[PDB]
Design a protein around this nucleic acid. Sequence first.
RNA 1: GGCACCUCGAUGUCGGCUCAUCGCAUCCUGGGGCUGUAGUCGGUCCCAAGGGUUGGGCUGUUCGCCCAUUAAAGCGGUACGCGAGCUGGGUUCAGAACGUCGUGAGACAGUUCGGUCCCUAUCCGUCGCGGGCGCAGGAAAUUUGAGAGGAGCUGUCCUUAGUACGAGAGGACCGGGAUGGACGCACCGCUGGUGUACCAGUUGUUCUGCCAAGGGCAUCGCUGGGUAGCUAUGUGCGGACGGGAUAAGUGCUGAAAGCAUCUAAGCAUGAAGCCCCCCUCAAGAUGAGAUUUCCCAUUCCGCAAGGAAGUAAGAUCCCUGAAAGAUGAUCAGGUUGAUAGGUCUGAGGUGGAAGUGUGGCGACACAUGGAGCUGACAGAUACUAAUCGAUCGAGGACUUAACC
Lengths: 206, 119, 54, 115, 122
Amino acid sequence: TKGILGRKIGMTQVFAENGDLIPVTVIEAAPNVVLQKKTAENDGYEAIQLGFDDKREKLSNKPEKGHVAKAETAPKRFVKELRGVEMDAYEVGQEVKVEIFSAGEIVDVTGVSKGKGFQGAIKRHGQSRGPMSHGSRYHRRPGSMGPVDPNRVFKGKLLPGRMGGEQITVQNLEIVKVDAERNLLLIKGNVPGAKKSLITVKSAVK
Amino acid sequence: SYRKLGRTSAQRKAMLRDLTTDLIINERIETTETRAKELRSVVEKMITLGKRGDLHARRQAAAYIRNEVANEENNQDALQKLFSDIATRYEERQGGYTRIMKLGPRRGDGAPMAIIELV
Amino acid sequence: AVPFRRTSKMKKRLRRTHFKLNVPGMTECPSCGEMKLSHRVCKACGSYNGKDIN
Amino acid sequence: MQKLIEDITKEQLRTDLPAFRPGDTLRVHVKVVEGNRERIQIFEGVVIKRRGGGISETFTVRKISYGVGVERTFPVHTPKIAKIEVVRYGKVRRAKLYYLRELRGKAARIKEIRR
Amino acid sequence: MIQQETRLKVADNSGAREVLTIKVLGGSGRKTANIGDVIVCTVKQATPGGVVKKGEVVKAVIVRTKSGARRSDGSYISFDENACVIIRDDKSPRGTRIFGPVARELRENNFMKIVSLAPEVI
RNA sequence: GGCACCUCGAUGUCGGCUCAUCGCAUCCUGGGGCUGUAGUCGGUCCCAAGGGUUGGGCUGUUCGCCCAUUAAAGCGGUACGCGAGCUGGGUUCAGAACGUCGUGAGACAGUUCGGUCCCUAUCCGUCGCGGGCGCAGGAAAUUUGAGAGGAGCUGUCCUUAGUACGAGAGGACCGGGAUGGACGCACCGCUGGUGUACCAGUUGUUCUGCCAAGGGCAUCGCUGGGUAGCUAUGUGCGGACGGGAUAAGUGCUGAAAGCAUCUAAGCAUGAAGCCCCCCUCAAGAUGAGAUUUCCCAUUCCGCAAGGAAGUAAGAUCCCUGAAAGAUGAUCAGGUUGAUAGGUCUGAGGUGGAAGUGUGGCGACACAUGGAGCUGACAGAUACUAAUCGAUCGAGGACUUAACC
């Protein structure tokens, strides 16, 4: 498997050199760096921890400073790790850049979704609401709790609450275009997460 | 965004206009904190109009601030006081003509009071 | 829409455990003499950030 | 973001489109392909909307056809619009000319500006 | 988006003038319908002299709608009326001639017979 | 239905709406036996509860019949599920009326018109979010995965192939490819909605001394548009390919019981079912796990049980905010800094400003001039605000091996 760590900048459209028109999401990914090569014999599994964005020394605490000291680079703001990659393929501290991907590849993208705050049942789980007329005083309520015999309400009934902020995955996205000189990726379609948020890009498992 | 201030759009606009006029009048003003925070941008924008000083700016400002007397012996309306005196005093410093000093909360409701001053 | 059993003294106190209000933020005014809130003009000294305010 | 986006889309945005306003009447050549036979279907109508920025910026045009109106909308910088020519400049006020949808039958006069 | 009980304007000389959508053919429960696919419908009012009377059930293809279609190119085609053409299940129209423009959608959604009879295709 | 056992110091009755959830005696989809199974289509039975299992006319009605479809339009339980969730159309009050019975007041599982549906959630329970403490030092991150939750549905068409099969009519299994219906997730680039500190026109009255130009009110006065954000009817994406053990079924070998035998000993194969592969949560997993890195093991007292008091790393208070937000919280920043507001330059939106001059009796029309204005949108900029501070925050017990 392969992947890189980047930031979502915006969304636009691009023509595919056929007459068709493609909507595309624009992701910038300055060259990531591998910080730690997690290996089975000590850590119980194989993986690489890598970091993307930089931090000023004012914000870089001494612990993470010493941690990154092995890779000998600037303290990295965001760090994440990928499984299933070949340990031997990556030296510790080497850069990943974006040319590892290329136009035409199928891709799966994951990231935190847009927050939406305390929302009602209709907005949250999309279930119909009572009639708006004929004297109905049941405009936007979340439904009956449950039967009587169990003398309680079962687990897992859908009720109001917070929304957004859980990492989501979109499967089988396509990399329309890549611009290494800018450190730019262009994914077909749309991706979770607000603007300038962190997005992670992985080769599709399927 | 912009604060709703807990009142409809009409009287919100009227209140902001009154606050701006009172600032031009007194040069120092004591209100609650959030009123001051909202007042900051609009008053320092009126300052930009005053510094620009063209007749279009005169009419734009007159469409906003209200005609109370600012210097009774000279009968300086707020418009002329602004454009002549205040705009000249603030033509030198390219934006940011305001301050917010925070005070202890008021006795009645404990709301956070603030001092605005053009400076 | 009605309590079914009177709440015990223990439950009452336990609910009240978090009802306390926390102390404000004190900072000794650099202008000498007394204490003040942070980022608030000192009530007594009438000064802030060194500069004197009338 | 805005500067970056226009930087990555400037190479694709077209260059050979004459200036026109939402109130003008105008002809467009669309290189439709039918049966493995590319051919220009010619469409004449009155512009209504110019909306959007960058390459996103898109425009619309309206034709009356056999007693039925048809509104055609294109992305402006599309590759399969072969040629484009304004035939007459219209003198109107509004920015988006929505009211011709309701209004029909020579009450929809478009004064020629000659400017 | 033509819809159940939506009223359609007949676009041919089969004698019918207005039809009422019985509902849209296709999947189990279909809420909507765009240009291209047959729908079952009853003629609600019709010209006196014609092969179609008043109030029989027939099948028609919606030929143009005022909610437009989208193309993979990115263009859009919107009309000022919702109209349909009556068809027997061999996909040929029952009318000898049709009126008004017609969407290109009906060629790949194969109704090339109707397209050929049509006076204008966009 | 029979009984009257709980409830008449009150347990709200039909149907519908909202929300579901369970059984399988299966309506579809999956896998098989038999068939009076030629083939497409069927009938019966077995395994199978993963998912799905439609919109209208009539009626208060469930139930039914009807229209049009779909793969199918399953049967039941949950106080004939669900009124401190809703509806009140009917039964079940007081008014009135028709028929009938009654000498009569009046009465009809006979009918008809009308007819007040109360409640601030205390405790369990459910959906979210915080604080405290523990994890035999204190911190900043990354993680293992026990163990939970979601999805897990399907049509049509091209081909194989007019091929098997069928005098014929008609028409395949199996296997490839495209596309669709409903759902679910995500997001404004597109089409649109909204957009009440954006732009423009416009009626009445009133005010800014007057003209001009503006202000207040009139649903934001009304109307035509519309940035960001939010958003679906808009767009992208998924239920894919597979592994293991099985259900029914089919079996190979082979006796019991020289034969036969899917069986008792062995070996296989075999479902939308089961366990994984997919996605999310997850160390309060008190069994509190692992890895990477930093701080170091001071000062006081009974010397020592063990206490308290300044600190290390690192946090907090307080302040500027949002991509976050009910408030906590999370995230971006606090002067060697772009966190927010200004200022300047743009995007987009409105769309031809004021003032002038020209033409015209005039309302008005041109030029100045893609002008003027512009909320959130993105760049730069130290102009104002984030200052002085204070608080919290380590010094570490027996044994196996092995080494100062």
